[PDB]
Amino acid sequence: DKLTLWTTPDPSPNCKIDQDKDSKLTFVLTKCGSQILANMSLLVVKGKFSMINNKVNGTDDYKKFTIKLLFDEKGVLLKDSSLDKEYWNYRSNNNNVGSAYEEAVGFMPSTTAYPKPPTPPTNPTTPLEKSQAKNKYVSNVYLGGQAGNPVATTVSFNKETGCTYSITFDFAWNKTYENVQFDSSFLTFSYIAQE
Amino acid sequence: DKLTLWTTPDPSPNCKIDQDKDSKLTFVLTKCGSQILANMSLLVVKGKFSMINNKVNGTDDYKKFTIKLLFDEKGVLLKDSSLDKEYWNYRSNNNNVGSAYEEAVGFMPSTTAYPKPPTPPTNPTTPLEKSQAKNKYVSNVYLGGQAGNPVATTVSFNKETGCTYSITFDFAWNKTYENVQFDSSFLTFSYIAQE
Amino acid sequence: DKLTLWTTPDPSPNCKIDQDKDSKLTFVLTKCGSQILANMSLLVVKGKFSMINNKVNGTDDYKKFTIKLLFDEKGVLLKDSSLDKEYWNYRSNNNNVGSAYEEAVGFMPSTTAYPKPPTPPTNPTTPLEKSQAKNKYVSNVYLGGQAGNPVATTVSFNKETGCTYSITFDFAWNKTYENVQFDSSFLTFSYIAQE
């Protein structure tokens, strides 16, 4: 088989935030049985977040954006994802000139560990019987790889509607950045796999 | 064998902070030879930390709590842990209707890498010859999965006295939370295994 | 083979920041195919950062330092690294009284994922076509394992000149520490491997 499903190395951009080939997403999933081991970088090369300036454009919509990975019931990427299908496959093996095939359910984030979330009660004083938060990793990345340029990053599992599985990346910051390209330090986490 | 030792999926709560079935701890250990790969979520469903309000209860004891995993010399959970033994076993395999057995030493945190810590010198100006900190991962979780609701989380290895190995989770915050359920984003780290 | 390449357990110090045996670096690499799984602790036992006091020594050079791992084209440590070669090998196996040998290319950080970085344009307004940040994990450690004692830590891949591969650890803080030994909580991340 192959145990690593990733963003094939091409010099080309492969991702759309607002416009086609906005961005070059690096994303690597390596399977350790029950946990998938994730690593991700993001470079946005044109559009609103290549060179950010919030002194100029300070409205909320210029300080957050989202990226969506959307899979079918067999773990194949759907057209409507942010990531272009052509740049997403397993690593080498008998998948070198076997080219873009799939099944990949063992790389999907468990619908048991990460279910469709319930509807939060009417009263927020009322405590939950089951978790709204448990499908989110909330961490940071650093633009330019500089400690001074944080971007709050929320990875969320199986919360999108297009699909059967989903990995969603929601970035957002408060710092009023002045001329700073969105070019991220990498983020590493792990998640519970389906089978 | 099985390589993943975890909190069996049950809708039921499985953990005690102050009272029996206070809390529903999700905790997954996946073994990659020398490193154990950990993932953890926490939902507290009744007690002091289901709905936190520190405008009402502002004393130090309402802004910190602890969870303890305690193992014997073979890597079996002891009764006195926060986590209920009945909800802790390997993942499926020949352990589906083989039910709660164990040995699990390869999932234990190394007593060589994480020893009983020495006694810190009389003078704190005096520098150490061996580490007090090296058995702690110190990170955060996010209540509601919201960047604005951090909780400082200190995972500590083999520091408890009941036992032969130990994984301890010490949560604590300064934010004066007003009506906020302790429902955590997940935390991922790795640790050095025994054998 | 062996899948874990690490800092052999010895009570002795094994690392040089400014002077020989300054420091006792714990560092463990465990290979999961395409990703290397890293874990690191640091104790500095003499020199400037055993007992830090920035009320006394407040200049920039007393609030940052660096550690370098430098490998040849086969993944062998070079003399000039911060880490002493004698304390760095695979874990047991047929490498117990086979002693210090190597090849270890599969533990090296990919020169495809982590290349020699390009030269940042003349104008910083000009947006990049390829990433300057993508070879850095930027995170923290906690001196004494205390949430109140952060140290910003930047792990950087293949940026040094002595060598063919490199893992570099750049620590730095703003807090004016008063009498606090540099004794770190551990840091865990993963990185993309070569082959």
Residue numbers in the entry:
A (entry chain A), B (entry chain A), C (entry chain A): 2 to 196
From the primary publication:
Here, we have sought to generate high-resolution crystallographic structures of the cellular interacting fiber-knob domains of species D adenoviruses HAdV-D26 and HAdV-D48. The fiber-knob is the receptor interacting domain of the fiber protein, one of three major capsid proteins along with the hexon and penton base, as shown schematically in Fig. 1a. Each monomer interacts with two neighbouring copies to form a homotrimer with 3-fold symmetry and a highly stable interface.
This is likely the result of polar contacts formed between Ser-307, Gln-308, Ala-309, and Leu-304 with Asp-359 and Gln-357 of the opposing monomer stabilising the conformation of the DG loop. The proline-rich nature of this loop provides further rigidity. While loops which are less flexible and/or stabilised in a CAR inhibitory conformation, such as HAdV-D48K should result in a fiber-knob which is less able to bind CAR. This hypothesis fits the competition inhibition studies shown in Fig. 6c, which demonstrate that HAdV-D26K has an approximately ~15× lower affinity for CAR than HAdV-C5K, and HAdV-D48K has 500× lower affinity. The known CD46 utilising HAdV-B35K is seen to bind CD46 even at low concentration, while HAdV-D48K shows no interaction. Whilst we have not been able to model the interaction of HAdV-D26 or D48 with DSG2, due to the lack of an available high-resolution complexed structure at the time of writing, we investigated the interaction by SPR analysis. HAdV-B3 is the best studied DSG2 binding adenovirus and showed binding in the μM range when tested by SPR, however, no binding was observed when the same experiment was run with HAdV-D26K or HAdV-D48K.
